[PDB]
Amino acid sequence: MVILKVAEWGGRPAKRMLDAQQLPINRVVISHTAAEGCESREVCSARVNVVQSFHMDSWGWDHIGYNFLVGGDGRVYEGRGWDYVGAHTKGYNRGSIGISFIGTFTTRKPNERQLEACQLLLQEGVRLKKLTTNYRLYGHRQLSATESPGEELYKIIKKWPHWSHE
Amino acid sequence: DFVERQQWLAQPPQKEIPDLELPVGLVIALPTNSENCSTQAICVLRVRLLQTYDIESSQKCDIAYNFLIGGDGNVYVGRGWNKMGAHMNNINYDSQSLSFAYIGSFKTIQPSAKQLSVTRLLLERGVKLGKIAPSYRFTASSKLMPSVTDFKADALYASFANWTHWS
Ligand SMILES: CC(=O)N[C@H]1[C@H](O[C@H]2[C@H](O[C@H](C)C(=O)N[C@@H](C)C(=O)N[C@H](CCC(=O)N[C@@H](CCC[C@@H](N)C(=O)O)C(=O)N[C@H](C)C(=O)O)C(=O)O)[C@@H](NC(C)=O)[C@@H]3OC[C@H]2O3)O[C@H](CO)[C@@H](O)[C@@H]1O
Ligand SMILES: *[C@@H]1O[C@H](CO)[C@@H](O)[C@H](O)[C@H]1NC(C)=O
Ligand SMILES: *[C@H]1O[C@@H](CO)[C@@H](O)[C@H](O)[C@H]1NC(C)=O
Numbered sequence A: 001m002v003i004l005k006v007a008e009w010g011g012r013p014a015k016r017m018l019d020a021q022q023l024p025i026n027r028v029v030i031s032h033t034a035a036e037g038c039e040s041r042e043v044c045s046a047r048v049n050v051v052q053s054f055h056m057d058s059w060g061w062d063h064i065g066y067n068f069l070v071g072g073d074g075r076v077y078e079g080r081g082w083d084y085v086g087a088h089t090k091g092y093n094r095g096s097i098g099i100s101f102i103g104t105f106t107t108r109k110p111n112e113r114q115l116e117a118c119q120l121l122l123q124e125g126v127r128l129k130k131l132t133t134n135y136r137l138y139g140h141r142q143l144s145a146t147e148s149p150g151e152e153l154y155k156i157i158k159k160w161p162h163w164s165h166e
Numbered sequence B: 001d002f003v004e005r006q007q008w009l010a011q012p013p014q015k016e017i018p019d020l021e022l023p024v025g026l027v028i029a030l031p032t033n034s035e036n037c038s039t040q041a042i043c044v045l046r047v048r049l050l051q052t053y054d055i056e057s058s059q060k061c062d063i064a065y066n067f068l069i070g071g072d073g074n075v076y077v078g079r080g081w082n083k084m085g086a087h088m089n090n091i092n093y094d095s096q097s098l099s100f101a102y103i104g105s106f107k108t109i110q111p112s113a114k115q116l117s118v119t120r121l122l123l124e125r126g127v128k129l130g131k132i133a134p135s136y137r138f139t140a141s142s143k144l145m146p147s148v149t150d151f152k153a154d155a156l157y158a159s160f161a162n163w164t165h166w167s
Helices: A041-058 A112-127 A151-157 B039-055 B111-129 B152-159
Strands: A025-032 A068-072 A076-078 A097-101 A133-141 B022-032 B067-068 B075-077 B097-102 B132-142
Touching: A025 A112, A025 A151, A068 A112, A076 A112, A076 B152, A097 A112, A112 A133, A112 A151, A133 A151, B022 B152, B039 B075, B067 B132, B097 B111, B111 B132
Parallel strands: A025 A097, A025 A133, A068 A097, B022 B097, B022 B132, B067 B097
Antiparallel strands: A068 A076, B067 B075
């Protein structure tokens, strides 16, 4: 598994110090970016930079909103990481990890590498004690009024063992 | 001066969109009836949120417009030069025009001088590229369909009233 740090994908640091999470975290929220996907380090880095600008400049947040993003190249792009509170799911940022699949998965499935990367990321979080052993996983749409993470991606994660409707 | 779809986080279109027969003889101005914008970062917010509205509330295949013009004087690429828009909800008009949407609401508020000047450059670029016929008509969506309340933007259209190609 490759996790590219903010600096490694050419991103900016936070505008100010972010709030720290109480670890271990037992909620994960899966979203998509609802923009174009990507199949290489160059293209995915480009996509994540635009996302960071949207969150920091257009919305005026203090950093890219996700804890992690997963590219169609199979690489993980670090956002806020495991230890800080995100800006991805209103009311649920504290005590959760927000992971966004880069792309739009309303009628198209995420690819083999993207799904593999996310599975490895979650297993790494449990292994490092960032996530509880019995963490609950949700689609963004269960917690917020949205299409996110896209019907085809949501149908996939609904069959994952950690998925919860509570 | 052009902000490409990727730069505004555009969602890819839901399905294939039909090509226009080019060049078009008609260019149509419309308001977005969203809040306006004076910087690229806020215009990007406006355009990306309009795209969602157009797809998810209006059930369109993509943002409804060929190009969008922000108060910052930048041109935001919508469906572009070559694809049919969905601005009039009428296949006769939509298949035979390009749409320029002005980001904001302009019933009493005027567009910025930037918005108006870049419109001139945008129309000229279209003529040079074979997308707009040299003898094009530029008109208001509201003139074409007087009954449509969302097309009303008196202060926008008054700003083009003395332009030679305006009808
Ligand atoms: C196809 C699709 O998914 N469309 C959805 C569409 O998805 C959007 C899409 O949204 C995606 C799916 C997304 O994951 N959005 C996250 C980032 C989002 O906006 N989440 C908000 C929460 C944002 C948030 O928590 N912000 C913090 C900001 C905090 C600022 C500062 N303290 C900091 O920490 O930086 C906040 O308010 N926190 C408070 C304190 C709280 O938790 O109570 C939510 O769902 O409530 C956007 N893409 C990106 C990359 O942002 C882009 O803009 C429109 C479209 O494309 O969203 C609209 C709602 O606007 C939905 O109706 C659509 O169905
Ligand atoms: C945007 O709208 C506000 C409120 O009407 C106005 O004061 C401002 O000048 C407008 N900005 C532009 C056109 O750049
Ligand atoms: C109509 O607009 C005027 C200003 O309101 C004149 O400056 C101008 O001559 C005319 N517009 C053009 C240049 O076509």
